Amino acid sequence: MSFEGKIALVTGASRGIGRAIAELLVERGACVIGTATSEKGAEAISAYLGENGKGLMLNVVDPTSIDTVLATIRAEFGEVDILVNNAGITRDNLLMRMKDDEWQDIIDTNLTSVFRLSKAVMRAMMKKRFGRIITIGSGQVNYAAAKAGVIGFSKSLAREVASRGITVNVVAPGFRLGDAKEIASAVAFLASDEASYISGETLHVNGGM
Amino acid sequence: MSFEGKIALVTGASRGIGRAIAELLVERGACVIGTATSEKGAEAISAYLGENGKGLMLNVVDPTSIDTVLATIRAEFGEVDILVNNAGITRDNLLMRMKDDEWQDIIDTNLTSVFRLSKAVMRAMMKKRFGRIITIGSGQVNYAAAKAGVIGFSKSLAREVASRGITVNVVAPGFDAKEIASAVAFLASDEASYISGETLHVNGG
Amino acid sequence: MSFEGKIALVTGASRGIGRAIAELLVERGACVIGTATSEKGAEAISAYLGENGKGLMLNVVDPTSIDTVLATIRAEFGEVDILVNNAGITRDNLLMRMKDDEWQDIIDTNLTSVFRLSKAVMRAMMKKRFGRIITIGSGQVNYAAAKAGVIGFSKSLAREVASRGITVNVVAPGFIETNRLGDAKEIASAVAFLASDEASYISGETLHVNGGM
Amino acid sequence: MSFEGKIALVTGASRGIGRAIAELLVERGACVIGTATSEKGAEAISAYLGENGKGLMLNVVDPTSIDTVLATIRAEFGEVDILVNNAGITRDNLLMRMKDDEWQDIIDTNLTSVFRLSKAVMRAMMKKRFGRIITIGSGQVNYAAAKAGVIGFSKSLAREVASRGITVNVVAPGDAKEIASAVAFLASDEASYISGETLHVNGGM
C-alpha cells in the first residue's frame, strides 16, 4: 500500500529518473532523502521535497562522504528502510581509446558504490527485519561491466539476506520511448510491502525490447 | 491501482494462486471470471466471487469450450481486458516411461491453451487500446518444455503488440499464493504499462 | 575428435546447415543417416553421402514414420549414437492471423518431434552409456514458442540423463547466409564439437553462433 | 584444429585448470606462456612446458608488471594471439563482515585485470586480424560481481571487435582437462564465429 513510516535514500535525485522516484515515494507517505553531486543540486532537491524530506550532497565513491550523509540521516530522521541506487555515470570509449581512469571511475561509481551503500545500511535493515535495496541500471565495455556486476552482486546478496526480510533488486529502464514516471512506478512497487517475496530480480521496463 | 470497469478472466481459479489472484482483483474493483475443470468447482468459484463476478467451467484444451465461455462472458459481462492463464497441469515421468499422451496433454493444456486464449481476447483488446495477458508458470521434460514455450510465446507476442497498449507477461513462482496475486495484480494494473515480455519471479531469493 | 564407428542421425539434411553438419561428421569418420520429407530428397542425400551413409525419408510428425526409419537404421547400420534435430519449419503469421493448424504444425514439427526422436533413441544410448542429442534452433510466436520449448526440454532432459553418459544440447545460429553471423559450415563445427568426446560434460547448454552480432 | 604458429598467454597456469589449459595447447602445437604470482611458480611452469613455452611472473593488478611481461613475450617469442584469463582469487565474507580491502582486491584481480590485459593485446590482434580472448569464471558478493562483470565486459567487447576477426568469450566451470577442451575449442579456428558467449561446463546444474 503506502510507505507511511518509511525512510528512503535515493542517490542522484536531481532530475529525471531519480526525481520521479523520489516524488512518487513521498506521494505515498515516504520520508525521502535525495542526493546530488553538488550542494547546489541538494538545495534544489530539498526544494521540491519540502518538509516531506531533504536534499543532501553525496560522493558515492568517497567513503568519508557516505558516512557523513548517513549520519546526517540517522540524526535528523532515522535509519534508512529503502535504498535506491541511481548515481551511475558514463565514460564511453572504444577499448583502446579508453584510459584506466575512465574504466576505474565507472567501476567505482556504478558498481563499488552499490557495495558500500548496501553494507552501510544493512545493519539497521536486519535489526528492523525489513529492508529494500534497488539499483537503477539502464564503446561501453566499462558501463557494461559495471551494469553486469550490479546484477551479480544483487542476486548474490539477495540470497544472503533473504531470511532477514530484506530484498535486493534491480530496475532496468529503456533509457514508444520510455517515461521516468513508469520507472518510478516499478521502483515503488518493489519497495512496497507487496514485493516481499520478490528479490534477486531484474525488472525490465523497456516496452518489449 | 484500481481496476474500475475492467473485466478479468482467470483460468484455474478454484483454489490456491488462481483463487488468490481472482480475490485480489475483485477487491480492487475488477469484474472477475474464474474457471474450473468441473461444474462442481465452478459454483465454488462463484460462491466466493459473489456479486463481483461469476465462476464457469472451461476446458482449455477444447476450442469449442473456449468459444462458448467467451461468448457467455461477452453476453453477460463484456469483453476481457485482463487474461490470467493459470490452467496448467503435470504428468511427471522419466523420458523412457513417458507416453505420447502424457507429453501431448501437457503441451495442449499448458502451452497451446495460452495461444488459443490469447488469440481469442487479443482482437477486442486492440480495439480498446488496452490489454493484459499474464501467464502463471511455476522427470518433467513435458512440463519443462511447455513452461519455456509460454515464456518464448509471451516475449515474442509482447514485441508484436507492444504499442497497441497491450502487455504480455509471465509470473513464475517457486511454488505464498497471496504474494503471487500481488505480482499479477501489479502487472495487470495501469502501473505496469511499460512492462511487457517480462518474467517476474516470485521466489524471494 | 573422430566419429569412427558411430552412427549419426541428422533430420532435415537436404541442404544448408543440415547438410553441412552431415558432411562434416562423415569427413570425420561418422556413419551418417540424413533425412528429408520427400523420397526425392532422400535420394539426393544418399548421393552426396556415398557409401559413408544413407538418405531416408522421415516425417517427424508421424509416429509410424519415426518407427519405420529407426527400424531401418538398426537393421542396416545399428544403434544411433548421435541425434541432431534440424527438421524444423516455419509458418510465420501475426498471432491474430495465425490459424490453429499453423500453430500446431510448428509445435508438432519443431518441439514434439524432438521428444519422440529423443525418446526413440534413448534406450540404446543408456545401454551403451553414451548418447548425443543436439537440436538446431535459430510475427513468429509459434516458432518462438517451439524453440523456447526445445531449450526447456533439452535442459530438463540433460539433468535427467546426465550421469548416464548422455548430453542434450542446443546449437543456436544467428540466421545464416543461405559482419555475417556465420555460415552452414560453422554451425556444423559447433555441432561436431558437442557431439565429440571433448564435450562429454557439456550438457543442457545453448551454444549461440552469431559471432557477436 | 592444431595451433601451429600461435602464441598463447595463460595467466595463472601453476596448477589445475590453468595448467590443464596450458598443457593441452602445447600438445596441439601452440607456444604457450603460463604465468604465476611467484618466480618459483614461474620456474615450475617453465619446467612442464619444456621447449614448447616459458613460465613468467605476473601481477595482474600491477600495470608495470603487465607491461614488462608482455614486452618479454614480444621480445623472445612474438605477439600474443590467444589470451586465457585464469588469475582469479576469492576473499569470502558476508556483506557486513566484508571489508573494503577484501572487495576491491577481487574487483582488481578478477575484473579490472581482464580489462587491462585485453586492452594490452588488442592492438596486435586487430593487426593480425585474428584474436582469442577467453576468461574463466567459476558470502561472495564480491566474487559474484566480478564474475558477472567479466561476462558483461566480454559480451560488450565481443560486439565491439566482432568483424575484426577477434572473439571474446567466457568459460564457466562448475576434470580440469575438460575445461581445457572447452577453452581449446573456442581458441581454435572452429569457433571463429562464436563470440560473446558463456560456455558452461557443469553437467546441467
Residue numbers in the entry:
A (entry chain C): 1 to 138, 147 to 183, 208 to 241
B (entry chain D): 1 to 138, 147 to 183, 211 to 240
C (entry chain A): 1 to 138, 147 to 186, 207 to 241
D (entry chain B): 1 to 138, 147 to 182, 211 to 241
Share the article's original sentences.
Ketoacyl-acyl carrier protein reductases (FabG; EC 1.1.1.100) are highly conserved and ubiquitously expressed enzymes of the bacterial type II fatty acid synthesis (FASII) pathway, catalysing the reduction of the acyl carrier protein (ACP) linked β-ketoacyl molecules to β-hydroxyacyl-ACP thioesters necessary for the formation of saturated and unsaturated fatty acids. FabG enzymes are members of the short-chain alcohol dehydrogenase/reductase (SDR) family (also known as the short chain oxidoreductase or SCOR family). The refined structures of the two crystal forms of YpFabG reveal that the protein contains a typical Rossmann fold motif, comprised of a seven strand twisted β-sheet surrounded by eight α-helices. The YpFabG tetramer is formed through two types of interfaces.
Despite very similar crystallisation conditions, the YpFabG TMAO crystal displays P42212 symmetry with a single YpFabG monomer within the ASU, whereas the YpFabG NaBr crystal displays P1211 symmetry with four YpFabG monomers within the ASU arranged to form a homotetramer. Furthermore, the loop joining β-strand β5 and α-helix α5 within the YpFabG NaBr structure is largely disordered, with superposition of NADP+ bound and unbound E. coli FabG structures indicating that Ser138 located at the start of this loop region must move ~3 Å to accommodate the nicotinamide portion of NADP+. A single phosphate molecule is observed within the same location in our YpFabG NaBr structure, however the presence of this molecule in only one monomer may not be sufficient to induce this active conformation. The only obvious difference between the two tetramers is the presence of the loop joining β-strand β5 and α-helix α5 (residues 139–147), and the helix-turn-helix motif (residues 185–205) in the YpFabG TMAO structure, which are largely disordered in the YpFabG NaBr structure. These regions appear to alter crystal packing, with symmetry generated YpFabG TMAO tetramers packing in parallel, and the helix-turn-helix motifs of each monomer packing against the same motif of the symmetry mate, whilst symmetry mates of the YpFabG NaBr structure appear to form crystal contacts primarily through helices α1, α2, and α3 at the corner of each tetramer. Overall, the structures were similar, with an RMSD of 0.35 Å over 205 amino acids, however they also contained some important structural differences.
